[PDB]
């Protein structure tokens, strides 16, 4: 089902209206809390002393109804940024009055318009309201794609509508939101109610609202086209935008009178329900990821921390990862031991970081289909996983698999390996210290020995997400640096965001590394061409790995392994967001840094303006060796 509401500016009887609105199938009602034509005075007598009541009784609905079914609306005569001081002072008093009555009723949301450039005093009054009491109401800023001035009929002789293109001018209503949003200091309680016009703007105007906290999409009845049978439908361009908004799980608001008078009003809502069915169903990935959209998590450190039973369980359920590892070992065995040497040559396989042994099983499944004899070592640091390995070794594997309870950098190998096999990769590939671990294990690989994986490469892309910026910003803990949350990466299913430029490679590691001087420290300058006006909030991280030859895994969106859910993207946020105009280049600088105890990332933006260097000396974030 789709969560939908009715917008009314006429409610004669709140009881009858809500019953009708509920019967039509709407989940909530957007209505005025004071009569919208009822202008009030707060200074000049005699209008100041108008006898009450000033609006309806709170007793006309149950508490539950106010909290769930009602959305408040600001009376449209309230103009806090009026050039007339008398209208300014009254609109202030009226705005507080109506907002305070919203809080009194316990309404879940309240609608305020952004219908002009200057909303500075509107922002001041709301911001002051947010800091007065312990109330919990959301604030839906009602803003259109296209400003009414830029869609007025060209019917004024001596004031014609501009034909010459204005790329910045067509994005004016986003700048209204940005300024208001910025003045109110990115309040979690201030979201967008995006009003869809009859004629949509250019894609760049629509793309501008990617990454923005859209809680509502307002659909006027006027925008709906009639079909042969007489029902309201939408254009394919409109349908395409509704499909995008359904992914963001926004609430739909129907506004205006029934322009399809011949048919029932349900018809409008029925068409949204119809479109909600006719979207493509969620794939295996999108089903698994369902729940984790823009949820910030600490990147795992399986070297420093011992992973839990249920953590290994989750990661074993990824079918693609292990089928690819199986295929990679399968291809490596046949390349190493030919048909004639089959029964003579036994290959020494070593699973380095074996967990509960899904790569052990994959190594065994690979050996049977390859039809080549193998001796297995299962090296695991975590002694709780080692319990699971040894119970498997006794009951199933036997003497073929040798369970070792050791760090792979410490372990004195009885014999050298033909293939070393590992799954030490993070969301940024090297962020769980696969380079350091395999470097220390390298000495007990043969001179001609293979590493699986053989190669991996990280990728960075700049993103706009005021949603995620605000989400990061709210991870401030007591008893630490109050900007430390901005100087550490998070693993997150990036959902409400905008990728400002194509991902480019960051850091690459090869195994084995036969370098006379082995240094895993890195420095990488990246230049990202940006084709849009936007605001940078951080960089999305991804990776690709070569397991063996053609056999690969990837979470690069453009080369992503189908159905593979073991790694969500990683996010590197920035303390202060950076304005980026069309044509400009975002220049970012990433360092991989280390001593004997710690490994960490430092990063900075150098174009089009400079950020501070983030996480200097790993002051906010380190990865334990």
């Amino acid at each position: 089902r789709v969560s939908s509401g009715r917008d009314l500016n006429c409610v004669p009887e709140i009881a009858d209206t809500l019953g009708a609105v509920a019967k039509q199938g709407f989940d909530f009602l957007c209505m005025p809390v004071f009569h919208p034509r009822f202008k009030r005075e707060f200074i000049q007598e005699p209008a100041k002393n108008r006898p009450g009541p000033q609006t309806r009784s709170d007793l006309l609905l149950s508490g539950r109804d106010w909290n769930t079914l009602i959305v408040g609306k600001l009376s449209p005569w309230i103009r806090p940024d009026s050039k007339v001081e008398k209208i300014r002072r009254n609109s202030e008093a009226a705005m507080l009055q109506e907002l305070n009555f919203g809080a009194y009723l316990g309404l879940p949301a309240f609608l305020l318009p952004l219908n002009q450039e200057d909303n500075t005093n509107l922002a001041r009054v709301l911001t002051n309201h947010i800091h007065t009491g312990h109330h919990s109401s959301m604030f839906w800023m009602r803003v259109p794609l296209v400003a009414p001035e830029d869609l007025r009929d060209d019917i004024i002789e001596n004031a014609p509508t501009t034909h010459t293109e204005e790329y910045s001018g067509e994005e004016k209503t986003w700048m209204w939101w940005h300024n208001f949003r910025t003045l109110c200091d990115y309040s979690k309680r201030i979201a967008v109610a995006l009003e869809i016009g009859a004629d949509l703007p250019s894609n760049h105007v629509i793309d501008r609202w990617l990454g923005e906290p859209i809680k509502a999409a307002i659909l006027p009845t006027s925008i709906f086209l009639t079909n042969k049978k007489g029902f309201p439908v939408l254009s394919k361009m409109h349908q395409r935008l509704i499909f995008r908004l359904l992914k963001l799980e926004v609430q739909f608001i129907i506004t205006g009178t029934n322009h399809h008078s011949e048919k029932e009003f349900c018809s409008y809502l029925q068409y949204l329900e119809y479109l909600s069915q006719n979207r493509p169903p969620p794939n295996a990935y999108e089903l698994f990821a369902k729940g984790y959209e823009d949820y910030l998590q600490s990147p795992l450190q399986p070297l420093m921390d011992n992973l839990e039973s249920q953590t290994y369980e989750v990661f074993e359920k990824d079918p693609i990862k292990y089928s690819q590892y199986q295929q990679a070992i399968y291809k490596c065995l046949l390349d190493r031991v030919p048909e004639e040497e089959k029964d003579t040559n036994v290959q020494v396989l070593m699973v380095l970081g074996a967990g509960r042994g899904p790569l052990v099983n994959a190594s065994l499944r690979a050996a049977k289909q390859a039809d080549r004899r193998i001796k297995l070592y299962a090296v695991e640091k975590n002694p709780n996983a080692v319990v699971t390995l040894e119970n498997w070794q006794f009951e199933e594997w036997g003497s073929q698999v040798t369970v070792v309870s050791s760090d792979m950098r410490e372990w004195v190998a009885p014999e050298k390996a033909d293939i070393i096999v590992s799954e030490l990769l993070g969301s940024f590939a090297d962020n769980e210290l696969s380079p350091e671990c395999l470097d220390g294990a390298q000495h007990f690989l043969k001179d001609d020995g293979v590493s699986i994986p053989g190669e991996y490469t990280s990728f960075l892309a700049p993103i706009s997400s005021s949603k995620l910026y605000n989400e990061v910003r709210a991870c401030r803990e007591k008893d630490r640096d109050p900007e430390a949350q901005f100087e550490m990466p998070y693993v997150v299913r990036l959902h409400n965001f905008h990728q400002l430029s194509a991902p480019q490679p960051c850091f690459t590691f090869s195994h084995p590394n036969r370098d006379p001087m082995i240094d895993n420290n890195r420095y990488c300058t990246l230049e990202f061409p940006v084709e849009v006006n936007t605001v940078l909030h951080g960089f999305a991280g991804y990776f690709e790995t070569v397991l063996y030859q053609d056999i690969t895994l990837s979470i690069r969106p453009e080369t992503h392994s189908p159905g593979m859910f073991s790694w969500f993207p990683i996010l590197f946020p920035i303390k202060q967001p950076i304005t980026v105009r069309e044509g400009q280049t975002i220049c970012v600088r990433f360092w991989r840094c280390s001593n004997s105890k710690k490994v960490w990332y430092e990063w900075a933006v150098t174009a089009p303006v400079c950020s501070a260097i983030h996480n200097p000396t790993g002051r906010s974030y380190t990865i334990g060796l």
Binding site: N9, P12, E13, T55, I155, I156
Partner: protein, 300 residues
């Protein structure tokens, strides 16, 4: 008729025989509706029991006007233009059409020269020309970029009318032109419009700052009121006087030079409509949200 009428009096209009039309809204309390009333005795008003006719509407009255002598055109909060008619006895008021064509509150309405067509303004920003016989919208005009505050039909021209909005535009209209609107001039938002009844190419406009202005279509202005000018109505004289309303709760009456002749702070709330009697040209009836029907003797 209804048992009791609503506190907020929005409209007051005299026809030829001197019968007073009243529109009312409930802008506060349980029910937010409105009503229409006829008073053959104007001194009796606003007393409900001693009235000729009275009817309940679905929603509030934002504005109304007479259609000839019998019909009543009504701007509804519902987003509907409503036409009511008196019976032959003029005892009941019956609905003729109630068409929901505006997407927000209908704010202003005015009857054209012919009396067979009317123009409406709404918060949905659009202006609509009606056929009162066919009960349909001939033209839907989205000229403005904000609320349509006031629409005033030309006295002696069926194709011409003024409109003004919170986009700070005063538009002269002529439906004969392929681009029918024309922007006149501003500064402070225009809030009220009135054509000069004798001089065809002259009108007056009141702004939100309380300034009444005289305009020749081919400018004189006075700071009359201390708040928004709600309404402007010319007297029925050959040399007409100008009544001016405001949210400062006062009435003024002004000469050709916009000079103050009369003043009344008799209302204790917003003054909403003025209407000059055709029987006695010196008498002027005002209505406000204080629920007063005050009859003024203008020193003419």
């Amino acid at each position: 008729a209804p048992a009791c009428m609503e506190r907020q009096l929005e409209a007051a209009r005299y026809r030829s025989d001197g019968a007073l039309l009243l529109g009312a809204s409930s802008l506060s309390g349980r029910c937010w509706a409105g009503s229409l009333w006829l008073f053959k005795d104007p001194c009796a008003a606003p007393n409900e029991g001693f009235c000729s006719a009275g009817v309940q509407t679905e929603a509030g009255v934002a504005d109304l006007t007479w259609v000839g002598e019998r019909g009543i055109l009504v701007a509804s909060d519902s987003g509907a233009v409503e036409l009511w008619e008196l019976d032959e006895n003029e005892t009941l008021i019956v609905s003729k059409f109630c068409k929901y064509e505006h997407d927000d509150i209908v704010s202003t309405v005015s009857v054209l020269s012919s009396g067979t067509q009317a123009v409406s303004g709404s918060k949905d920003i659009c202006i609509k020309v009606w056929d009162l016989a066919q009960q349909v919208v001939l033209s839907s005009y989205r000229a403005h970029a904000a609320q349509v505050t006031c629409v005033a039909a030309s006295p002696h021209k069926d194709s011409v009318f003024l409109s003004c909005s919170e986009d700070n535009r005063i538009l002269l209209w002529d439906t004969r032109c392929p681009k029918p609107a024309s922007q006149i001039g501003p500064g402070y938002l225009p809030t009220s419009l009135a054509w000069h009844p004798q001089q065809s190419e002259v009108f007056v406009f009141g702004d939100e700052n309380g300034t009444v202005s005289l305009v020749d279509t081919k400018v004189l202005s006075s700071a009359v009121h201390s708040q928004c000018v709600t309404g402007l109505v010319f007297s029925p004289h050959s040399v007409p006087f100008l009544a001016s309303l405001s949210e400062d709760c006062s009435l003024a009456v002004l000469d050709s030079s916009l000079s103050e002749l009369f003043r009344s702070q008799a209302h204790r709330d917003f003054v909403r409509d003025a209407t000059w009697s055709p029987l006695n040209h010196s008498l002027l009836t005002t209505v406000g949200w204080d629920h007063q029907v005050v009859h003024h003797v203008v020193p003419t």
